[PDB]
Design a protein around this ligand. Sequence first.
Ligand code: SF4
Ligand SMILES: [Zn+2]
Ligand SMILES: [Zn+2]
Ligand SMILES: [Zn+2]
Ligand SMILES: [Zn+2]
Lengths: 752, 32, 356
Amino acid sequence: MKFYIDDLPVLFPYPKIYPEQYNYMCDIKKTLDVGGNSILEMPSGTGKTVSLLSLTIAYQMHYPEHRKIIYCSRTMSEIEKALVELENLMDYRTKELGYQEDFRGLGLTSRKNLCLHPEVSKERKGTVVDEKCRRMTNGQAKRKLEEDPEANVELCEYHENLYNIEVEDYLPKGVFSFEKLLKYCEEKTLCPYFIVRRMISLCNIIIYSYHYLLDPKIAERVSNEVSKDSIVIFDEAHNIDNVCIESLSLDLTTDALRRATRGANALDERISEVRKVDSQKLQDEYEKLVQGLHSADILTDQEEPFVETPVLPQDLLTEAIPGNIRRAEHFVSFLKRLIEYLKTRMKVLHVISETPKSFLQHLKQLTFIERKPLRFCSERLSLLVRTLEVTEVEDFTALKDIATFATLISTYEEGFLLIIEPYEIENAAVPNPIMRFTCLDASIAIKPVFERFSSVIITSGTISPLDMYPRMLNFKTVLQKSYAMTLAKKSFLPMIITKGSDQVAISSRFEIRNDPSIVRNYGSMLVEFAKITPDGMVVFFPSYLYMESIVSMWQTMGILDEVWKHKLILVETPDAQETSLALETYRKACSNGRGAILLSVARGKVSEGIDFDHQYGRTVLMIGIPFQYTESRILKARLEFMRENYRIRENDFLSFDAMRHAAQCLGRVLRGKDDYGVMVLADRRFSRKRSQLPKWIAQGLSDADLNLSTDMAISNTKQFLRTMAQPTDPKDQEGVSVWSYEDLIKHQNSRK
Amino acid sequence: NDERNELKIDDLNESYKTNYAIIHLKRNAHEK
Amino acid sequence: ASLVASIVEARKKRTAKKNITPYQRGIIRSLILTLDCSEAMLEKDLRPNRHAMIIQYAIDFVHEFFDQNPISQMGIIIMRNGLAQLVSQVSGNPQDHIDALKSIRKQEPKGNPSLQNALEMARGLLLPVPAHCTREVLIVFGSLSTTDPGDIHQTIDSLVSEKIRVKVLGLSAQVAICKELCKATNYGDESFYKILLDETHLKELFNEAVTPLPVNKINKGFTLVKMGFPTRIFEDTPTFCSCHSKLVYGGYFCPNCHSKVCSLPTVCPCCDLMLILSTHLARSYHHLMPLKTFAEVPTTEKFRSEDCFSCQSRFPILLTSSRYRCEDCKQEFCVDCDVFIHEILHNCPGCESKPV
Ligand code: SF4
Ligand SMILES: [Zn+2]
Ligand SMILES: [Zn+2]
Ligand SMILES: [Zn+2]
Ligand SMILES: [Zn+2]
């Protein structure tokens, strides 16, 4: 349809529109017009991405500011889905306006997911792919070939072919998803990664993940190209704190330090050989360093620093090199003694938690390393590695971790902690000491975003309660609200099971993980629900270890044998490729009617973007509250920091963290309003967490289902499925849950 | 294409319309 | 307000009956009745068991189907041990199918069902059917899972290519493959996949399956079929029948080869000519000229007569007028008659009585 807001015409790509979608678009427009940030919670069963794209695109194409759009999701599959939705919307707009309006919309990702080189795309890790692509595109090979054609160094045809054409003619006008972009770039022998990286500054809407906006290692270069007045959308942003925390966290192991020593020795030998044969490079680098130049002024735009900036751009010192690490040999000795200090600190016999200030003071006492020279470690190492002609950097890969740790610890002092644990795994014959540098404040990484961008939309399907997010991340919202879906008939049945058919309490507490009664009760619940579930059944476990142990117990008891008769069994595995193939097999089994059951981890890879709708997702078994590991030093320190700073109780934060993932898994069942499912939360502890669930799930959770039994839940599930299998009366949803153009006009007239 | 079809929201599309053919039977037959 | 509630419920029920149009329907049908006999059919949700109730309703369905579709044919397949077992070849004799069901009712159901196997067997059975007939497959599915040796999607595509139409009646919940089959095989229509709610609704669904399905506008198979009307013969001595090679007192004489046949309607065993009676064709005229619905008269206006035109019965006197009228002739009818004229008879007495 094509309807009108107060002054903004918006073209919806469907003849029908939901009242929730209309209200959501109105609220988003109000937020954009008034300026500031907002928090929106939309039900998972109502089109959210389509409404967001429609309203934002109409806003940008109608108003004269023509503000660009930045879309930030949590996963690459979500980027693909958003790009597909954008392509559909643009197709509708092109069919309605009579012409293809000037528009360019691209996604952005790493080299591993966009490489077409037959010899570089066959790697199992992205770091190696990046290193090889740098070897083929840094310009060293091109310069060597220019000076001497006989040089055996080879180039990348995809990268070379781009120089022939201009940036504005890289791709035709339109929206390019990853699949279409790969097909086009394969047909024309071009590099999609470089196409996107060079067209970000020109696209109307750019779609990427939260890492490309929060992680300073890859965020600075991309952010330097986007506009300052663009709209910012955070889709599925309920789990943004974890990303913000992991952005500025490092872990060092004994193997890492042992490899760093070897890397330092190799660097010293390389410096010696280059000193013997070609020293003018060292002299030139030293001369440039003396004036006060940095990596920005030394490195060309074509090349990149060896060590990614681990701190935010605003926290980098703008002064010249201190002088202690101005020379190659002096810097090498400094780095070597830093590594030795780390090694001698890795010998503690009990957990030690210390602040960066204390660590720096002890360093300055035992050795003579000052804070300022430490702050420049990564930058100096990047310049040195660039100038030493180190085409093979396998030996030097280790020094990156040391540089990152040094530049972080010497940079930040508040909201950061250093934990040294003699036992990385308590269940180990020999000690394996580990040093973790952890960020406790989740607002440090996101402050620059909230200050640089004026209007920020934070939208999600299971972001509740909305009051904590402004508390946890220091930002203020003009409005924060959640929508209640105006269902004509109940389509999803949420229930909580606190005990088994034997009336014995059931829980997923780790200390009682290996309990015959609880394990057998869970297995009986699984079998009974699988017997009645038509096509698909997703089970989410609190942790992978718990899933493994309980599955082994079920295998011994023979419950899996009973499940096999009715459905195939697919299990999530650590290997990402194997998990993806398992997902494909599960979808095929659900489509062909064979019936399948998928076991996964509530905090795993499936729950962070894979969506089960219609035939794929019918019943969701949340086996226990996905509580984090309480006996974790990092989590305990974060809880203490939050209690002291934001006045958030440890129990409250833990319950919020678990309920957030439970709701995340729950919300992957509905796409439209014609989809239905049964959502069983199997734990005695959910009975008091109804107020903590999202509003649209709490409203559907009845008081009689707060504490049920397995048999009674099976009966309710059978009745609910039988009821939902009947044809819906069109009049029951003609104008109460689905609105036509006339109904929308009537709503606008009544409201006005 | 296939991804678009899978990702599209069917519930918001136009309702399916039957395409059954109607017939009008005229009655005019001669006597035996 | 309870009586008014009943009246408004009656009005809502009549609301659906209001919309009636002379849709084109294929009278000549070839039906394949597939029944599910698997471990999932041993449940007690239907008393005494799913197998018993389904078989009984299948027998009643066969009787009704051959009562109201004399010139159609039926075949029976069952699903047992993951294999499709044929128990009745396609034929026009209701007694053979009834006896086949009476034989089936004894064996206990076991194993898993195989929709792909059943569909392949149905396709093989419907291959030798004329292009002017409507090929239909009615499946009574009870399981929530399907075990098949091959690709079900390929079978669905083959069915669509063969222009077969599939109706599925479920027991517990919707199956994704069943929905896809019933939708893709019916030109996108999603109303041919029904899940029952109780025994009465199952009976209603089985009765609904009896009537012929309307044909699609783009699917044209118009043609003339050569059929003959034989003359009954009364003989003094038994004679050998050309169909069963058994002695019978008398039989219908084919008008094309003079061979005698025991019962009608059946394809002649000699000249391969269909033998039918005029009544067999007459049984389907109401499917081509449906009687227009009757709308109740508001109490505001004045009634014509105090007694029913068709049955001469006093109209009950009390809020809501208990009168139904025919727009074609404008004759008041009582509630009891309306259902009889729209369920048993197919002609309006007032319209017939009115001269022109
Ligand atoms: S330039 Fe592109 S195609 Fe070539 S190696 Fe790098 S990422 Fe791969
Ligand atoms: Zn005979
Ligand atoms: Zn004959
Ligand atoms: Zn009449
Ligand atoms: Zn009467």
